[PDB]
Ligand binder design. Sequence first.
Ligand SMILES: CC(C)(C)OC(=O)N[C@@H](C(=O)NO)c1ccc(Br)cc1
Ligand SMILES: CC(C)(C)OC(=O)N[C@@H](C(=O)NO)c1ccc(Br)cc1
Ligand SMILES: CC(C)(C)OC(=O)N[C@@H](C(=O)NO)c1ccc(Br)cc1
Ligand SMILES: [Zn+2]
Ligand SMILES: [Zn+2]
Ligand SMILES: [Zn+2]
Ligand SMILES: [Zn+2]
Ligand SMILES: [Zn+2]
Ligand SMILES: [Zn+2]
Lengths: 516, 519, 513
Amino acid sequence: SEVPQVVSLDPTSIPIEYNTPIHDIKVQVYDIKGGCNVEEGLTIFLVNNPGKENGPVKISSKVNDKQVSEFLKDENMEKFNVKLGTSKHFYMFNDNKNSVAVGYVGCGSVADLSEADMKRVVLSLVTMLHDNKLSKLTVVFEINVDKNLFRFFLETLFYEYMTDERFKSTKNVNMEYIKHLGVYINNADTYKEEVEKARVYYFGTYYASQLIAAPSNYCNPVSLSNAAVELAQKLNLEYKILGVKELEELKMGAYLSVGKGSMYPNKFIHLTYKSKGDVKKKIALVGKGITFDSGGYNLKAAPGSMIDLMKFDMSGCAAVLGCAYCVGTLKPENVEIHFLSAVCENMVSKNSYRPGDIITASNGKTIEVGNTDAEGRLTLADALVYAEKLGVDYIVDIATLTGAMLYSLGTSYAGVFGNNEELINKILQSSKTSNEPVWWLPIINEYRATLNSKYADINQISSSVKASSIVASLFLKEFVQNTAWAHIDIAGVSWNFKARKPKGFGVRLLTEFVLN
Amino acid sequence: ASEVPQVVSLDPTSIPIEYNTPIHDIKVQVYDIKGGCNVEEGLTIFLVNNPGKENGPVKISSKVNDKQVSEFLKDENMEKFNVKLGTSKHFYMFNDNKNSVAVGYVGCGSVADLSEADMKRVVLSLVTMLHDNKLSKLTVVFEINVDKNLFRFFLETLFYEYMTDERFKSTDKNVNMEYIKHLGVYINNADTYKEEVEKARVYYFGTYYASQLIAAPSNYCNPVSLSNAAVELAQKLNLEYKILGVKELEELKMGAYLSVGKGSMYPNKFIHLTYKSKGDVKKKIALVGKGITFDSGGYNLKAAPGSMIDLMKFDMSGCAAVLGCAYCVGTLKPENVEIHFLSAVCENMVSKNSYRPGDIITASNGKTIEVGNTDAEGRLTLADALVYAEKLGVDYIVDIATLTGAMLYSLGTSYAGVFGNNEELINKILQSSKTSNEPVWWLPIINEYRATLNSKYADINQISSSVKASSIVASLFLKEFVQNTAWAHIDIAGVSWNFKARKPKGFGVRLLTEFVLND
Amino acid sequence: SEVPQVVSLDPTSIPIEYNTPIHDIKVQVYDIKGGCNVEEGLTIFLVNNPGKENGPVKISSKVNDKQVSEFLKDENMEKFNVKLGTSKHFYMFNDNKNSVAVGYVGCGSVADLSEADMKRVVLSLVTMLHDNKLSKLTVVFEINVDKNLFRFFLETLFYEYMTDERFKSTDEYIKHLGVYINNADTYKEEVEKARVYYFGTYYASQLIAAPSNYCNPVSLSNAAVELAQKLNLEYKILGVKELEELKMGAYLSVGKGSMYPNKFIHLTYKSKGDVKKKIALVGKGITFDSGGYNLKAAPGSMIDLMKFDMSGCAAVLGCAYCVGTLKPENVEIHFLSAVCENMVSKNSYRPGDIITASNGKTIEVGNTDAEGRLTLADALVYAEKLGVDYIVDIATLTGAMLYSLGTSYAGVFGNNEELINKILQSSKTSNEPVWWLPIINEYRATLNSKYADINQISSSVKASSIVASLFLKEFVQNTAWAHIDIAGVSWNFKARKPKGFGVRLLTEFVLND
Ligand SMILES: CC(C)(C)OC(=O)N[C@@H](C(=O)NO)c1ccc(Br)cc1
Ligand SMILES: CC(C)(C)OC(=O)N[C@@H](C(=O)NO)c1ccc(Br)cc1
Ligand SMILES: CC(C)(C)OC(=O)N[C@@H](C(=O)NO)c1ccc(Br)cc1
Ligand SMILES: [Zn+2]
Ligand SMILES: [Zn+2]
Ligand SMILES: [Zn+2]
Ligand SMILES: [Zn+2]
Ligand SMILES: [Zn+2]
Ligand SMILES: [Zn+2]
């Protein structure tokens, strides 16, 4: 619980903002079928034109104001375009002779907007929200969206609108979030239930983002495990933090070896949510929790190794904890979930484990270490045997495991591997409804022979096959004996290089998996 | 003084320093050339040139008070030799008293005004004549034109190159070393040049002292032993001194400086030396030196080709330059001036305790900094040092540092770069460069690159991820930690080490001293 | 004249747009004291705020329209801030019930805007123009700018507004520009000069942006001829046969491995009347630099960008446009470029080759990727024989510039301080930033060849830019000479296009001399 320090100026906890300005936004959903009121703040119409390429803007909605409706008549609007991401602002006086601000955002010419399409619309919308001191925003849906896409709109809106200023000291003086958000859409009553779900999904994602973005001197195994406890306490999760003494008794030799060279003791996070009624499904969610990945003696010194980004290497853990918030808040029924993460730090030291070392996992398997920079699968290995010992139905691990993902699926799609096709399908189904894209990749058994060690039971890495993501999955597969298991590699999708911030990828995905 | 920690008992606990050098035992005499030259014992060398006559014949113009020697040096005899820069010859003959004497010359080219580099070549050629000859006396006859500043440069360079560092020699000591005991100089209007002699001797040792600190390996020269050397120096010079330990640095919240040293076995030591004039103080100056006793690069380890990790003892050259300046100032004792000699000394190592890439740290002025590269640790330590410097309420802040390797690609190994926020201060540094003959060139602080230091989470980035103009970006960083004081920054990463001669130059000592003295 | 082809689909000329939509824009300048009228198009206020948080926007100028004045009231504008580059624009109806667009661009908190700052202002302004079907743009200057910066504003505006679609197959611009500024009469003379400076820069941009299959030594020399003919300049293109007779072995060696014959461009401008200054402007004209057998294969060598390596030539030709159009007095200008291509072939020159320059000096080649200085050597020998007063060469010579001054400031080297100062003065008034770097003679000894008269490159001295300058200096014996290294500033990496750097710089140099 106590964070060790080298000097007194080293931080001893991760700063966390629980009550965000987003939570102070009062959200109202009205049916468009009744007309729109255009009074205070900024009013934005989401408009398209199906199959007209860059077509003219047409406002279909009834506006309960003669002046505003006159301004928005077709003859006036035809000079404007519906190009995806395009936005404009209008100034006018209403019927009550008050000054009002109105505008629109183009949603293209395709009837069914994709996640990327919706993201671009929101990003354009957020641009209108920044550098304008508005008190209220009104969004009018003149496009077709189902409830899942509507929820995604809000989640993305909240997430992109929110700005992390925890580490700013000498800060934007003009930041001023809206206090009211009005939404006009048809059949408002079906969409109202998605509002609070979006708000929960937002913070779950933003919470994971805060943990990832937090630098390694702030976010260490002790401080992160402490944060998990604080989170568990607020949400009523049973919690248990395993220290070195417990881990040694449990013989987690693979996991403990990675943390040897660190000044922070290893901390194993175990949170549990149990429904009050009959439990029909038991699920273990495992997250990779490397607070910093230096590579060990296989130091990240090669070009393109992105060593300065390696605080992100606990993204899997953050996603699991972010999911814990959503589950703890929405309180699903007939399910018991274990939230696991073997947290440690991979550093260079006189105490560090060396390339060539043979270590023993808690399942008795001896492992020959060929590369200390492949430490993720080592910690995940012991975490998986622990998971299976819990007697669950599904084991789902999520991790920034291999850089090869950047070459396979890139920065938008995560890879999923597994030993069970139905479980994979459930993950794929969750991906669609959560709108966090995942693609099914194969575990090619032909590469297994490349993990055959001369002295230990198995090699940590291959010295042949360059398909590291598959090889790593083959390694993890050896530590799940008789349980449905899936592995999501998020090394490529976790960090937003363009926006220079985390995505909090996986939070909404894991929650949809649990809920449905 | 603090106790130097050891891993084994064989680890050195102090930097060996030679204060009394053979140069200090040399008696220097300056004569007027119009009185004629006496050629008796030891070696007598004529410095000769030939104006616009590309390798011209040698001609001795000076009167020699010896019939035999004057006949030997007559034009007819000397025309077989030429004045090519760096050329030297030895002559053997008998004088009027039937004694054997040794005479020679060094070619000074065909250009009337010799540059520092040219003069250096002349001196180097001269030193070769001193080497491997057991001489007791050297006599140098100036048949060329040099001003007082260039004349002093000759003596300083002569003393520096003649001197040999044998502190770390044990079984391979040179059995044949035997320095001259007397140095004679014949020059026109000598009375004007006499004041430069002792000044040269002072400037020499300041440079040689800095050289000794730099050349000292990192196991000998650590933050503790270097700060101890600073204290010992201050005591000898009657300067006020103050060494800040970790506890005091924490109270001052010097987080950037402390973060770099976290991974070291040697505690951070902040050097603060003070020279105060006895009279009314009219100018207050802070001299800040980068003091990284060893730069491994941190977790951004120097593992790339050309990173020169074996040279990284040099990375405290700025501190050494500052301490060498403290010697000169404390010795010549300029008045009506108050000088602060500062250096945030530490070591950048790889450890479980080391600071990581991506860490956000807080400087003593409250600015939060995101670390993108641990091998850019110099600017982190300088940041807190500059904030400390400005709190002293000085008129000028001048920092000197082996900051960026880009200097090797911009100005190279001969000229140092100077950046600043004040043009008058910059001109003064340039003025000091001319009179000290330590080359400096003005480089710009381009404000357009500033936006690349905008961090998403912290107040500022330590490094840029685009620009690649490392020296300018670093200056932009440091500028953020000097709020309202005239400040200049001298990057000596390229000029500090003499790669051809395999030794330090002690660059900056004479430059900084000239700056203080002529102010 | 005839461009050789490998296949019939290979282009045989560089497409050039001479008449741009920018030339069709009518520009009117009014005095701010008379008030602003808001009728057609888009109206943008350029505003600042000394000591700005960044602080709120406040419009001081009087607007002769009740509807617009209601919009521009302090209470409404306080919601916006003046942070540099920030902009907002709204659409509304004026007193005459016409649709109008009104807005602002934030100019920060500094009273005196820099070259870099003004560019950020312009880009934000241009961003609104690319996404609004406007007929007229009106700019209201509520900031202080001198005559030079105002001209710079227009040049940058015109240049960034213009879009190159020459190579877009398939698989709008405003017609009026209104300017409100204090002391309007003083700024009116700057308008047409800016339009000239614009195209000079944009013309150079077109040559640089043109790919190596379009822009080759033959097609580039042809383009120079066509330009000279339109400007009524005397022109002369030296071919291989003439070059051999002139014994330009260094220049000819670089082009040996190319399928395109070497072409030496020589344009000349003579002022009507007494000539008081004679100047030769030399531009590096490598249409493509593969590096030769010292192939650009190392990481970060950016071989896909190497069409840019004739930027120096383009800058000189762009200058030829400006000088030929504005027609300065008392001056004679020579526009020179030894154009060729550096390729890998059985006919290519090899590392280790010893070649003879036209001045008789033998050169040992240590790196075929340092071909720029070799071509410049013969060009400099050619230039001095013309008997000029100043020789100024401009070249993308060394990548080391990216490590010294970066992408914003070019480096200038020289043997004459008066010439250097004139360049620096020209840099200030043209707002194309240049910084004086030294030619350190101590490094000269590293060019001493064991067998030849001189080495092409150094064997260490990582100060490549200075060493190269030391090389070129050996080919100017008795003339005031300057060298501008634009390797770092030539290409705009963020915008993915050329800057046309040097055109305005060279013209100001000629004009103010
Ligand atoms: C097997 C091999 C030797 C290639 O090592 C890696 O697979 N490195 C990954 C790692 O260091 N895991 O801990 C990694 C690299 C980049 C990114 Br982004 C993520 C993960
Ligand atoms: C910003 C960057 C990542 C390039 O890091 C450097 O600037 N390196 C310098 C350094 O390590 N300072 O601490 C340095 C290298 C070599 C020489 Br020689 C001098 C100084
Ligand atoms: C050090 C060396 C002698 C090889 O010189 C180069 O660095 N090459 C330049 C070149 O290829 N001249 O022809 C160059 C490279 C990149 C850029 Br950008 C500009 C110029
Ligand atoms: Zn790793
Ligand atoms: Zn990892
Ligand atoms: Zn370093
Ligand atoms: Zn350093
Ligand atoms: Zn080249
Ligand atoms: Zn080139």
